[PDB]
Amino acid sequence: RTPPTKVSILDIAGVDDTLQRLLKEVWFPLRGGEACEKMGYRYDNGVLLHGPSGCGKTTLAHAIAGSIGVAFIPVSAPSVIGGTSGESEKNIRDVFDEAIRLAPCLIFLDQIDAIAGRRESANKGMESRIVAEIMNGMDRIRQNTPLGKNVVVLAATNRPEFLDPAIRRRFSVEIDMGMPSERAREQILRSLTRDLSLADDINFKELAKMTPGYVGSDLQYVVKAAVSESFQANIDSLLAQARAKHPADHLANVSQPQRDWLLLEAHRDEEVSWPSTKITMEQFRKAVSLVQPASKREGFSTIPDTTWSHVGALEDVRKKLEMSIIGPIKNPELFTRVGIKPAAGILLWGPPGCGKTLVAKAVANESKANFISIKGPELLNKYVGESERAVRQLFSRAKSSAPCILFFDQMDALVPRRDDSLSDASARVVNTLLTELDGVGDRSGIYVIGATNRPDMIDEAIRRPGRLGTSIYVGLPSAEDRVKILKTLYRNTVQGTTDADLEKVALDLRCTGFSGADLGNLMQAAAQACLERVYTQRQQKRKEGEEEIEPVITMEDWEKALNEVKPSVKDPEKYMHS
Amino acid sequence: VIGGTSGESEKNIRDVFDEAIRLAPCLIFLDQIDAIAGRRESANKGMESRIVAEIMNGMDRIRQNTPLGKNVVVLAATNRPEFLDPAIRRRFSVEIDMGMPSERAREQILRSLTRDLSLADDINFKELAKMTPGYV
Amino acid sequence: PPGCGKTLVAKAVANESKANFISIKGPELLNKYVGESERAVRQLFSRAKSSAPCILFFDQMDALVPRRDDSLSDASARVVNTLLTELDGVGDRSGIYVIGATNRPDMIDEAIRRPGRLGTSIYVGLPSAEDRVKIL
Amino acid sequence: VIGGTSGESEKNIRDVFDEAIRLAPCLIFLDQIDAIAGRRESANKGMESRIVAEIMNGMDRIRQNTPLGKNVVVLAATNRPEFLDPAIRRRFSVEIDMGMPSERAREQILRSLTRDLSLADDINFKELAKMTPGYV
Numbered sequence: 008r009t010p011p012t013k014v015s016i017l018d019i020a021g022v023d024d025t026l027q028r029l030l031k032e033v034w035f036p037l038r039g040g041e042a043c044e045k046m047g048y049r050y051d052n053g054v055l056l057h058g059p060s061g062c063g064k065t066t067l068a069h070a071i072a073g074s075i076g077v078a079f080i081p082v083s084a085p086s087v088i089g090g091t092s093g094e095s096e097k098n099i100r101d102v103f104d105e106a107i108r109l110a111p112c113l114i115f116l117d118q119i120d121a122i123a124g125r126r127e128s129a130n131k132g133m134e135s136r137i138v139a140e141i142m143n144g145m146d147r148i149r150q151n152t153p154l155g156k157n158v159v160v161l162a163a164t165n166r167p168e169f170l171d172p173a174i175r176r177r178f179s180v181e182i183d184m185g186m187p188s189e190r191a192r193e194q195i196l197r198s199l200t201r202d203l204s205l206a207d208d209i210n211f212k213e214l215a216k217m218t219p220g221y222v223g224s225d226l227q228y229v230v231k232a233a234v235s236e237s238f239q240a241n242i243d244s245l246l247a248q249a250r251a252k253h254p255a256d257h258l259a260n261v262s263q264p265q266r267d268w269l270l271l272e273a274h275r276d277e278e279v280s281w282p283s284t285k286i287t288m289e290q291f292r293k294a295v296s297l298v299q300p301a302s303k304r305e306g307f308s309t310i311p312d313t314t315w316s317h318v319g320a321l322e323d324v325r326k327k328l329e330m331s332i333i334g335p336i337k338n339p340e341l342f343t344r345v346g347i348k349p350a351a352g353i354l355l356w357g358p359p360g361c362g363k364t365l366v367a368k369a370v371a372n373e374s375k376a377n378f379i380s381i382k383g384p385e386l387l388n389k390y391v392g393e394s395e396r397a398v399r400q401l402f403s404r405a406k407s408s409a410p411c412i413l414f415f416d417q418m419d420a421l422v423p424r425r426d427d428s429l430s431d432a433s434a435r436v437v438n439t440l441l442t443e444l445d446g447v448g449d450r451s452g453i454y455v456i457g458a459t460n461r462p463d464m465i466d467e468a469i470r471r472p473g474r475l476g477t478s479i480y481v482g483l484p485s486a487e488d489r490v491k492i493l494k495t496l497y498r499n500t501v502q503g504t505t506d507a508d509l510e511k512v513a514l515d516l517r518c519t520g521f522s523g524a525d526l527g528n529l530m531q532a533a534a535q536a537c538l539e540r541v542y543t544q545r546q547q548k549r550k551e552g553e554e555e556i557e558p559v560i561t562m563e564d565w566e567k568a569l570n571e572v573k574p575s576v577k578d579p580e581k582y583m584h585s
Numbered sequence: 586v587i588g589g590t591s592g593e594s595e596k597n598i599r600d601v602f603d604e605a606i607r608l609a610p611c612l613i614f615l616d617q618i619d620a621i622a623g624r625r626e627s628a629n630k631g632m633e634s635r636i637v638a639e640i641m642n643g644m645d646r647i648r649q650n651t652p653l654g655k656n657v658v659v660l661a662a663t664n665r666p667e668f669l670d671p672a673i674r675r676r677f678s679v680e681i682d683m684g685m686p687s688e689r690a691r692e693q694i695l696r697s698l699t700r701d702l703s704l705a706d707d708i709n710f711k712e713l714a715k716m717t718p719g720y721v
Numbered sequence: 722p723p724g725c726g727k728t729l730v731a732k733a734v735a736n737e738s739k740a741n742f743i744s745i746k747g748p749e750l751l752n753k754y755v756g757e758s759e760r761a762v763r764q765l766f767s768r769a770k771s772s773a774p775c776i777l778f779f780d781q782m783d784a785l786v787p788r789r790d791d792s793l794s795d796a797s798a799r800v801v802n803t804l805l806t807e808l809d810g811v812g813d814r815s816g817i818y819v820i821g822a823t824n825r826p827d828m829i830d831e832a833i834r835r836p837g838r839l840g841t842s843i844y845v846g847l848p849s850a851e852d853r854v855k856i857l
Numbered sequence: 858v859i860g861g862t863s864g865e866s867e868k869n870i871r872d873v874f875d876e877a878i879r880l881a882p883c884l885i886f887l888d889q890i891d892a893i894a895g896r897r898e899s900a901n902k903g904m905e906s907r908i909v910a911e912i913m914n915g916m917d918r919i920r921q922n923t924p925l926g927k928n929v930v931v932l933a934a935t936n937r938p939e940f941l942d943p944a945i946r947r948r949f950s951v952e953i954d955m956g957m958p959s960e961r962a963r964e965q966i967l968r969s970l971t972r973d974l975s976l977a978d979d980i981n982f983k984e985l986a987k988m989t990p991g992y993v
């Protein structure tokens with residue numbers, strides 16, 4: 008005999024719509040058994056729960072059992088497997104036999120991909136036999152049902168693709184336990200906080216709002232993180248106290264962590280009373296900063312220290328970018344009220360080294376959003392079915408977590424291989440990419456940025472609206488802009504700043520025919536010439552006559568460097584026309 | 586037809602064909618054939634390829650015995666012709682396409698299901714069937 | 722031109738005839754398998770044949786058709802040849818009318834353009850005032 | 858002959874040859890040989906090359922045993938000679954070309970089949986054969 012367990016039903020929240028559906032399907036057959044028997048109509052047999060790990064699949068099942076008050080038969084993935092080749096099958100039979108005999112009951116199959124995976128992926132004669140046993144059992148239930156047998160088979164899996172298509176057909180009802188909403192997260196936070204003494208400054212609503220792609224397990228951890236952060240005060244107190252009881256002078260210290268450890272080791276049997284303190288909103292923010300879960304293994308590239316102050320000029324472009332990306336992320340209220348859908352993607356095109364890569368990062372930084380950079384051919388594999396699968400995976404990861412900027416550097420590699428016939432592998436990848444782009448427009452958060460030094464050979468299909476429609480040109484031909492760039496570069500030095508010198512340098516003819524990369528090089532060249540002057544002068548004086556070093560840079564150094572240096576890019580006609 | 590040990594499956598296929606040829610007139614019905622005989626290139630198992638071979642051998646045996654007084658017709662049902670091995674496709678001669686279900690057919694199916702239910706007078710199964718395009 | 726209402730015109734014709742309509746768009750045809758692509762195309766025509774009158778619509782044909790004038794691969798060659806074969810077959814029996822649409826006409830094989838296949842080349846545009854007000 | 862584990866395949870080949878040499882007179886028929894013994898350069902698997910080796914070993918064993926009273930002839934059928942490994946080609950001595958059925962050949966085949974039927978006087982098998990292009 009196996010009676011039900013006592014689990015809290017008030018623990019799970021944020022699953023309003025899904026729980027309602029589950030109720031409808033499970034309540035009628037289990038609770039009103041006499042009614043269903045009289046009518047003669049047939050009901051729901053199998054309920055499959057899917058979604059990521061730690062989503063509360065096992066808990067939901069346990070809760071449902073306890074709440075209804077029916078008999079719970081837990082079937083875990085390795086619980087039925089025996090030693091001899093026959094005991095496993097015998098046990099499966101006994102499980103189903105006892106289950107049909109005693110009613111009402113709930114059979115729960117936790118982690119089903121370990122028992123019934125694809126029969127083509129299993130070359131063993133035992134695994135295929137087990138799948139067959141399950142099928143046979145399912146049929147037996149269906150036949151017995153009109154008498155008074157009431158058993159519902161619940162099941163939980165982490166991946167639907169690994170399951171055998173045959174068992175998928177057998178199971179009729181499916182519930183997706185995915186990613187929660189703002190309201191849902193708020194509820195989860197309250198459930199966890201329930202046993203804690205929160206301060207008045209804590210607003211769970213604010214936490215929930217500023218918590219984008221976090222799951223039930225993640226929120227659980229954020230609460231735990233806060234607990235550890237608060238108890239740092241007690242650690243400091245103990246350290247001071249220990250250094251007074253056992254001084255040990257300066258013999259116990261070589262470093263800081265080691266000395267702390269040693270003091271505690273000496274104490275051992277010393278019991279201390281811990282005061283119950285309340286948590287602040289500041290402690291939660293600190294805890295949040297140190298958390299990185301769920302989509303941590305994705306390959307999340309951290310945002311650099313690049314701001315708008317690092318980019319000289321391009322003020323028009325800055326404003327346009329703010330509208331498109333920062334507009335929807337920071338002000339969702341504004342967009343919903345006016346009536347327009349949020350963006351999908353932009354394309355940065357123009358001459359090399361003009362700040363395209365920088366702009367992408369800068370925008371990501373500003374928005375305080377996530378950033379992923381895939382450059383040129385970082386997709387392709389040696390196998391026949393991995394490149395396409397990988398692309399699919401990227402979009403799946405992006406869909407799961409948002410806000411994020413997906414950056415594709417040098418699209419000049421993948422896109423031109425369409426207009427002229429070359430390969431089959433390249434064809435499959437680009438077609439999958441087009442497919443993935445089309446399959447996303449509603450439920451944004453993921454903004455795709457593309458960059459290319461060559462706008463020439465690219466397929467018009469990719470350019471079409473809904474895919475990468477906003478074509479932003481990054482070029483450089485004006486005087487005012489150059490002065491701003493010079494100031495921006497010479498801003499990051501640390502007396503003598505000299506503004507007048509910067510303007511004059513910009514005015515010169517040689518400077519007119521330059522680019523961002525060229526100006527950077529000029530600055531470096533000037534610095535090198537200055538070093539030569541400092542070295543020659545200092546060595547002569549020290550040897551003949553130790554003095555001080557002068558890092559100052561005058562105009563003579565700039566003038567000499569300017570005379571020598573020549574431009575990189577020659578013809579702008581190629582970029583503009585094509 | 587699938588068993589536990591690597592040999593019982595093949596033995597059963599033989600027994601099925603043997604009893605079938607012995608007793609006549611009969612109709613052998615192979616329901617869902619893509620699970621037994623899929624493409625031999627897509628099956629990396631040594632048992633699956635062996636089963637396809639057993640079916641082929643059985644087919645030949647029937648052809649030889651036939652002029653005596655053996656009358657057996659092999660019916661088969663599949664959901665997808667692409668998944669079937671081109672070899673077995675060649676063996677089978679007659680093909681019938683049971684396509685898109687009709688208005689009349691849907692009406693009949695609805696009646697079969699409703700049979701145990703107490704329907705009201707305002708319900709017109711004919712109207713339901715008409716406004717039900719691509720449902721199976 | 723791109724986005725002139727090709728889909729709308731196609732539906733209007735189909736609706737008026739009170740006939741069936743099937744729409745297969747560009748890359749929503751391609752699979753990972755090799756020998757299944759040709760069998761799938763055969764299946765589409767078989768389904769269309771079974772339920773006639775029907776209009777078979779192919780949106781954005783710029784993908785499949787240009788891979789003839791220049792030697793790319795073997796897979797693309799088989800698919801296009803099967804398509805040409807399927808088109809030639811349907812003409813006397815009829816009931817199934819194939820409509821193709823593309824925003825780009827340049828690189829296309831003249832063989833597909835020949836009368837009896839996709840021979841009737843109709844040029845479409847969008848320059849009307851009344852329509853623009855409705856869109857706004 | 859192919860099994861599940863890496864060894865059962867080879868064991869079976871041995872058993873086939875062993876039983877065959879023991880019992881005489883017999884005819885061993887290898888149907889579709891390019892699937893078992895293809896070119897060893899085109900097969901990057903360590904199992905396929907090993908199987909070709911097993912066949913070669915078996916062939917030698919027969920030659921040695923022969924002067925006692927062992928009478929076994931190995932027949933084989935293939936669709937393409939170019940796909941076969943040059944090594945096995947050398948082992949095999951006699952070759953028969955079963956070519957394309959011409960107008961004359963088709964006429965003969967028709968007669969073979971009609972043999973048990975009561976044909977009318979208006980039937981000219983010669984006319985049928987003439988107007989039957991690519992039939993096997």
Ligand SMILES: Nc1ncnc2c1ncn2[C@@H]1O[C@H](COP(=O)(O)OP(=O)(O)OP(=O)(O)O)[C@@H](O)[C@H]1O
Nearest residue numbers: 018019020059060061062063064065066067223224
């Ligand atoms: N939605 C949720 N609400 C509240 N608590 C949750 C939720 N999801 C998980 N938890 C906490 O995390 C624990 C793990 O839940 P559970 O084991 O049911 O997840 P799961 O999806 O079944 O994981 P797996 O399928 O990998 O076993 C629970 O004991 C619970 O305390």
Ligand SMILES: Nc1ncnc2c1ncn2[C@@H]1O[C@H](COP(=O)(O)OP(=O)(O)OP(=O)(O)O)[C@@H](O)[C@H]1O
Nearest residue numbers: 317318319358359360361362363364365460523524
């Ligand atoms: N406006 C700018 N401000 C600061 N640095 C710049 C600017 N433009 C170019 N650079 C310098 O050029 C380098 C490359 O910039 P970025 O990669 O963004 O240019 P790009 O247009 O992507 O061309 P490419 O990557 O092909 O060189 C950076 O390391 C940066 O120091």
Ligand SMILES: Nc1ncnc2c1ncn2[C@@H]1O[C@H](COP(=O)(O)OP(=O)(O)OP(=O)(O)O)[C@@H](O)[C@H]1O
Nearest residue numbers: 473723724725726727728729730780852855856857
């Ligand atoms: N996704 C859609 N599919 C079909 N019709 C649409 C769609 N969106 C809008 N419409 C209708 O068509 C008109 C807008 O025309 P639109 O510019 O979308 O060209 P279309 O040919 O209809 O769409 P598409 O170019 O995507 O095929 C509107 O009056 C609207 O009622």
